[PDB]
A paper describes a structure:
Light-driven oxidation of water to molecular oxygen is catalyzed by the oxygen-evolving complex (OEC) in Photosystem II (PS II). This multi-electron, multi-proton catalysis requires the transport of two water molecules to and four protons from the OEC. The OEC consists of a heteronuclear Mn4CaO5 cluster, which cycles through five intermediate S-states (S0 to S4) that correspond to the abstraction of four successive electrons from the OEC via a redox-active tyrosine residue (Yz). During one cycle of the catalytic reaction, the OEC consumes two water molecules; one is introduced into the cycle during the S2 → S3 transition and the second during the S3 → S0 transition.
At 2 F(400 µs), new electron density appears near the D1-E329 residue close to W34. This density indicates a new water at this position (W151). The new water near D1-E329 detected in the 2 F(400µs) data after the completion of the Ox insertion at the Mn1 site may also support the O1 channel being the water intake channel from the lumenal side of the membrane. By 400 µs into the S2 to S3 transition (2F(400 µs)), the Cl1-channel environment is rearranged back to one being similar to the S1-state, and no significant changes are observed between the S1 and the fully evolved S3-state (2F(200 ms)). At 400 µs, W150 is not present anymore, and with it the last indication of a fraction of open states. Therefore, the reprotonation of W1 can proceed from the newly inserted Ox. By 400 µs, all the movement around the OEC is complete, and no major changes are observed in the channel regions between 2 F(400 µs) and the S3-state 2 F(200 ms), Fig. 7d.
Residue numbers in the entry:
A (entry chain D): 12 to 352
B (entry chain E): 3 to 84
C (entry chain I): 1 to 36
D (entry chain F): 12 to 45
E (entry chain A): 11 to 344
F (entry chain V): 1 to 137
G (entry chain C): 32 to 473
Amino acid sequence: RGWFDILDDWLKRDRFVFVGWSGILLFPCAYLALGGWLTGTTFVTSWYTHGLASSYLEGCNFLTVAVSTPANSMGHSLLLLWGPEAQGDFTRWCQLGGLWTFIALHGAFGLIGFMLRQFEIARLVGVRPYNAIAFSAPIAVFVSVFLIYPLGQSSWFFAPSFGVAAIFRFLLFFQGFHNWTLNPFHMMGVAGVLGGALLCAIHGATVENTLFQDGEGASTFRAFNPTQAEETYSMVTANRFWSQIFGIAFSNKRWLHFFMLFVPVTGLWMSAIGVVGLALNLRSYDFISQEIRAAEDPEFETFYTKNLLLNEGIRAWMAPQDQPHENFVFPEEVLPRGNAL
Amino acid sequence: GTTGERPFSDIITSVRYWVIHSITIPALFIAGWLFVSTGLAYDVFGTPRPDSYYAQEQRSIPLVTDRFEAKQQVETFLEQLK
Amino acid sequence: METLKITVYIVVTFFVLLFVFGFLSGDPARNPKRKD
Amino acid sequence: SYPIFTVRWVAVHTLAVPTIFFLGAIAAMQFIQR
Amino acid sequence: ANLWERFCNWVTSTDNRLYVGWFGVIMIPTLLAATICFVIAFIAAPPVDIDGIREPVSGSLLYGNNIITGAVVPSSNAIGLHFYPIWEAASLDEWLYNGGPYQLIIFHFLLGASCYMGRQWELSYRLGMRPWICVAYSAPLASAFAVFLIYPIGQGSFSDGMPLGISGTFNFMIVFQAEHNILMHPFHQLGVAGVFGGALFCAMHGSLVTSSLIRETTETESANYGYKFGQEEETYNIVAAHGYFGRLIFQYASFNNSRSLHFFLAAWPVVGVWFTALGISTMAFNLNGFNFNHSVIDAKGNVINTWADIINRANLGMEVMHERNAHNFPLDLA
Amino acid sequence: AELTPEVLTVPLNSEGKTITLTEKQYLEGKRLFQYACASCHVGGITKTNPSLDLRTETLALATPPRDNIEGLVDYMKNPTTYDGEQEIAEVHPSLRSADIFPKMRNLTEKDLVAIAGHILVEPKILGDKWGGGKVYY
Amino acid sequence: GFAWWAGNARLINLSGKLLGAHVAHAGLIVFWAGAMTLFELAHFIPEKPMYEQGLILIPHIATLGWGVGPGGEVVDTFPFFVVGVVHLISSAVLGFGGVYHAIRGPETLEEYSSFFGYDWKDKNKMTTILGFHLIVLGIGALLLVAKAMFFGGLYDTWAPGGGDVRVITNPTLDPRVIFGYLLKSPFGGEGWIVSVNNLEDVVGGHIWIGLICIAGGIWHILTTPFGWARRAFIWSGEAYLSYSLGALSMMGFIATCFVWFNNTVYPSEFYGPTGPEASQAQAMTFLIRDQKLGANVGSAQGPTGLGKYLMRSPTGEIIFGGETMRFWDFRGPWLEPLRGPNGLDLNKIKNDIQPWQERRAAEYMTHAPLGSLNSVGGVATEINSVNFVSPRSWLATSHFVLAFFFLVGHLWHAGRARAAAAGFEKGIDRESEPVLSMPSLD
Ligand code: CLA
Ligand code: CLA
Ligand code: CLA
Ligand code: CLA
Ligand SMILES: CC1=C(/C=C/C(C)=C/C=C/C(C)=C/C=C/C=C(C)/C=C/C=C(C)/C=C/C2=C(C)CCCC2(C)C)C(C)(C)CCC1
Ligand SMILES: CC1=C(/C=C/C(C)=C/C=C/C(C)=C/C=C/C=C(C)/C=C/C=C(C)/C=C/C2=C(C)CCCC2(C)C)C(C)(C)CCC1
Ligand SMILES: CC1=C(/C=C/C(C)=C/C=C/C(C)=C/C=C/C=C(C)/C=C/C=C(C)/C=C/C2=C(C)CCCC2(C)C)C(C)(C)CCC1
Ligand SMILES: [Cl-]
Ligand SMILES: [Cl-]
Ligand SMILES: [Fe+2]
């Protein structure tokens, strides 16, 4: 019982906010990632990295403020406050985009801290660590979108910027440039997310409409005791219902709740993989057979060809302002446009 | 079902709580206000005031285009406003 | 086309009539507890 | 018989104190004119 | 015991492997009609002049499509909101060119799915259950009504309803953004919170219950065999689950009432998807997402771009390219 | 950059005389332009005849030249076609036709100068965006 | 046994408190109608069209013929003030009776007086209350007839010379016309009752409905439900609410489409143009412009091979080209002078378009019902400048939303009424679980 165990004792005391050894990593990094986002969105511009205003101080609202990414000219610099770019000057650090790397990196170690917290609390309390496991999907998404993606590109400039509309722009960038809706790894993530939300709603509704009558009140919430041993709803009646409505139904409450872990977690893992491909412009952009036919046969048209015209629109109309460092000058006459518009 | 800290509902309905925080809460608000009303927020963070995004006859963005000369590039743009 | 239009009109009327009269045939009473 | 200053106390003010400051800063901003 | 009461008794029978019901009497035929027509059209329908400009779009597999690009194509803009049954066409050839099958499918489907909702009410009553599962399913149902019926009504043509195909869906949602800025609409943002949050809470609930399963098996067995269908005892320890999640956050951010927990599970995505269905339904009447284009300007009056202006640039590229032959005048008002 | 008197200085007539608007006049003209003109001329284009814009170079080539306060104030009272060959008061807002265009009823002589001034100043601030259309949004 | 968040359900069997809840809530509706109208008047500038000013109640009064004259121009704002003030005043009286009955009056009425008291399961008393309210509604519908026929008339967008307040001397009574509307298809070119395009049919239909509602009111006072009705329905307060919820939901959807398509009882003069109208006006605008420049609009082939300005509808009518082909069912007072038996008449187009028609088309094209939530007018890609959202979009969207939630409420309360009536709305009896007494499906 030396100093290490006495410190262990203190880190793991039962208090309103559990700390633990994971708290040493989690709490500073989560607080700094969050505080950096609030600081930059209230006070810091994107004028020198992006040519954009991006703070409340400048006139932006909650939907348009962001902490934007560094200039493309920074490459993948860590942009340390003490590094060769900012050289200790806080002001220049902010104007060069140092708060982006600040938030991303502290966020990454924050997520590690949070997942270590999940392991720590599960071991102390005595449960299996499946909540930590499930949280691997949020982590995979974060590192593939916010770190791997920009590391295969030219710079951090092309990572998502931390803002509402900045993220909307990121969605639209991926359509025009990567044709990301066509990517089967995204489609699996879409089915995982929409699949989870369905499972969430259908299971909650089912439980709430197969309840046993365990009190006399019209509010059925009171008739539950957390220490009761008995199930609070009829799996048997739920099973019959869905068997006769839908054809099949859950019969194993363990499989049911495992499946609810499995579906959204697998979806997110799948989308992460596709984004890793897009790090390298390894896109599912085209179907070759379609393009060969369409080039030869001007009367052949599909929703596939129609959407690529839209992509081409997006690229040429947004690129000069979205990539200011490229100095794209597109004369009016070269912009793709359909009739009249 | 408690870990020993004082209940929040007990604290915020207490006279002592509100004697302290009727001062601290408005003082911080006033502090934050002054950070902006004085201009300090601009100088600290480097954020352009409404008259210093461009030079008068300039419609070019002062985009950083060098990694290790970036600091000096920004400074050069800023001096082009005087 | 008129033969078809006629057929479909008859089929729909039939199933709609089944629906309305089915629910008028003491449907409140078709439940497991209180029948009335 | 409660303690005043706790780990809970700190987590609360770590969040609450910068919040009020930032709210005052953002309130002031609604009066900035171009 | 007369012929009619026996039919009534079979229609509403709880002994049928699949419950029929009075709602089922309308649901089964309308769903069979939509399903058969969809399958046949997806495979073999000839190209369809969706936008009324005599520029047919090939949708089916036999005409050079794969699963991803295939679609049953919306009916012609020349038709607008007119009713186009088979018997209004001079021939099936004409009906196929103008997109007749789309109307047949979406109308039979919207009917059958509406009766599916009521079928869910109906069997709950026959079984002695509480009645509101159908309320949960009205969130997806309303979303299908929005993209197949409401949006066509407001824009005046079923040719602007959502196509029945993967890539056609993406076309629909790209064109929608260009014309309504749906991303900057708060009801779509609530939909995202509904489906992201519902995916979250699905994983949370599933991981917390899975985390607190009572040891009932060996390590050579699936843990799932520790639960037997219809056992009376709960299969996990909710107080351990509460004890873990309350420490992961803090005590009062964790449920210990399983009834309020599952009601919450049901309500979050349902309400979020009601709002996003209401988003589509109100953008049908052109009350569009926030517009902050050129909202920030400097002391002289220069525009200072924000991310919303960048959004606007992408929206423009989508606008000017979509239905590239179908506009003769400079505003695309519908 | 700011709204300096040089950018608020615009041509008064064709003789070359100049007038220096105030910031007050510029902002009042912008609000009046929005009130009475923007539904068709947002951003210096013309939604119902896109071949004619409010760009300075276009106004200069109108008959009656309209790149000056005077020509604009006269246009607001008695609009003509671009070659000046016919009066179009009956299809274009004007004081002469304020009976059929009621938003022109409560416009004073000084309001006309303010609207004219905004139209002449704004391309100096916005450049090509003024009258350029959606390419430049 | 209800929680605070379902607290109004505690009123189901307190007829006196429930009465105060209703009357107080009616005070709120009347208050809003009064305060909103005075708000709109304080903000009203008569030089601008109503639809540039965010007005939804002033257009409802103008449409009844008050305060306007030829062409929709406002001549006198005093009728607006009166309508607002009187509503405002009357909410105080409803407020007074509502709070009195909810707080101070007899909690239940059935002991105080056997006439005002009611049991939800009393099918005779219930149909009598329904009968009274039907008679009231019938009177209401006849007050619209009184106004149109005997007290000044209604605004007629179709009147000769740009629209005007006109007295209705010959309302349509022919039931083939009145009920023929109920049997029109809701699809395009038919439009069910939304297609009503003249005031004679509007007024005559309200004669009919007033008589039918009074007829039906007397019927339900004098009868009780036949046994087939007794067996088809649930007879409870919540069940009755659920029936009304479906009814209002249905009515809200209908009203949504009414304000979106109909330009007769929602004159475009007051509400702005319809979507279809504005889109037709654009094609008209550039047809006019190009023909003045010398273009032969009849013979101009557009890029697709269809006419650039003019083409045929699927049944042959000459209609505007481009994407507005979808809107050819549109009919409007500014456009109809150009229509001949085969649709738009090329000889009228070449020779007979008037400046007022040029003006109107230009106005409506630039006031199309498109705009952002923060009220920037136009397509979503438009820059800030024009502060505008059509009253038609505001009214359509709001009432679509309300109609949706009331269908949800219908389903909620209908399902709960059914289950409460059969006795299992609080859940499954563990000792008598129905499924456990059924044979398994396999
Ligand atoms: C004529 C209309 C009407 C009437 C009289 C009732 C009456 C009733 N309802 Mg029903 N209901 C309706 C419409 C109606 N409802 C609709 C349209 C819906 C669908 C949304 C529902 C959904 C519904 C549910 C889910 C439940 C009821 C319940 C009840 C009972 C208790 C209600 C209570 O105490 O609420 C108390 C009131 C509140 C808690 C306030 C609600 C606040 C709302 C949600 C926010 C609205 C604000 C709005 C969006 C604007 C925002 C701006 C901001 C400044 C606030 C009561 C008999 C309960 C029941 O079954 O009892 C038997 C119940 O559980 N209702
Ligand atoms: C239009 C909305 C509306 C209306 C009319 C009512 C009406 C009523 N409610 Mg419900 N209720 C509502 C919304 C509404 N409620 C909402 C939104 C909620 C969710 C929070 C509830 C939750 C709720 C509960 C939990 C209960 C009720 C109950 C009641 C009844 C008795 C309340 C009582 O004793 O007051 C006592 C309150 C006071 C004495 C405080 C003063 C209230 C006054 C009247 C304020 C109005 C001032 C106004 C400016 C007066 C103008 C004066 C002028 C007319 C002369 C009453 C009929 C109770 C009930 O059913 O009884 C069995 C009950 O238990 N309500
Ligand atoms: C539909 C709503 C409604 C209903 C059903 C009732 C029903 C009742 N009220 Mg309440 N009351 C109401 C609204 C309502 N009241 C309003 C709006 C007010 C505010 C003025 C009051 C104020 C009030 C008081 C102060 C008292 C009652 C009492 C009573 C009871 C006896 C009434 C009686 O014998 O008078 C019989 C009828 C008359 C004496 C005269 C009726 C002639 C009326 C006024 C003309 C018709 C009005 C017209 C149809 C609509 C308005 C016109 C407008 C559109 C311009 C009864 C249970 C009494 C009670 O409960 O005591 C225990 C009691 O003391 N009421
Ligand atoms: C608010 C209005 C209202 C309400 C709630 C009621 C309610 C009732 N009436 Mg009354 N009724 C009313 C107005 C009203 N009535 C009026 C104005 C009249 C005069 C014409 C009548 C004449 C009347 C008669 C003659 C009878 C009733 C009866 C009944 C009971 C059974 C109703 C029933 O089964 O309908 C459910 C409807 C059906 C079973 C038939 C469905 C047919 C409809 C039209 C299909 C259309 C569907 C379609 C989607 C709608 C679009 C429009 C359509 C025209 C195309 C019930 C208590 C019965 C009773 O017991 O009397 C004592 C009865 O025999 N009512
Ligand atoms: C970065 C950095 C740092 C740090 C910092 C920090 C840590 C910060 C913090 C900060 C913070 C911490 C902030 C805060 C803020 C907040 C706010 C700003 C809030 C707001 C909110 C609101 C607005 C809300 C409201 C609402 C609504 C709207 C609705 C509902 C209701 C409510 C109420 C919720 C340092 C120093 C290291 C240095 C380096 C850099
Ligand atoms: C029961 C209850 C409730 C409810 C309530 C209610 C709903 C009430 C209402 C009430 C009402 C509803 C009220 C009203 C009022 C009104 C009044 C009081 C009025 C007055 C008026 C005036 C005074 C006027 C004046 C004028 C004139 C004459 C002219 C012009 C100018 C002016 C406007 C100034 C609550 C929820 C709370 C809770 C529980 C209980
Ligand atoms: C005013 C007017 C008019 C007229 C109108 C009228 C004449 C109308 C009527 C209407 C009516 C005449 C209506 C009716 C309706 C009905 C309904 C809405 C129904 C309902 C039904 C139901 C809901 C049922 C249900 C059921 C079944 C099916 C089975 C069993 C169970 C129960 C009973 C639940 C016109 C347009 C000329 C013009 C303008 C103005
Ligand atoms: Cl397209
Ligand atoms: Cl067009
Ligand atoms: Fe569960």
